[PDB]
């Protein structure tokens, strides 16, 4: 759009782009304190890299490539619930 929408940017817009709240949008977490907690142990990666800083704004392009890190206990539970655990892929 035009410059009209440019006057709506506030602290809320910046807070919505934080890494923990994106997990909360993506339904990877259901509570903010749980979403924050997942980050520092290192269960969450943005592409190849693992991000431990809760204060981290993720781009729209990078938002497509956020997922559980491999060899994480949470990813085991997701695969177990879906009956799709394959131990060859570790």
């Amino acid at each position: 759009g035009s410059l009209e929408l440019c006057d709506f940017v506030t602290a809320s817009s910046f807070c919505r782009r934080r890494l923990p709240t994106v997990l909360l949008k993506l339904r990877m977490a259901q509570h903010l304190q749980a979403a924050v907690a997942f980050v520092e142990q290192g269960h969450v990666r943005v592409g190849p890299d693992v991000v431990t800083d809760p204060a981290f704004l993720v781009t729209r392009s990078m938002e497509d490539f956020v997922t559980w890190v491999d060899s994480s206990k949470i990813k085991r539970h997701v695969l177990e619930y879906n009956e799709e655990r394959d131990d060859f892929d570790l």
């Binding site: 919505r16 709240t21 909360l24």
Partner: peptide
């Protein structure tokens, strides 16, 4: 100021709100 964390608008923009409604 941001809304309450329990609010859905905390993590949803107007595009998501239109589709979710």
């Amino acid at each position: 100021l941001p809304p309450s964390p329990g609010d859905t608008s905390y993590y949803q923009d107007q595009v998501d709100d239109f589709h979710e409604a």
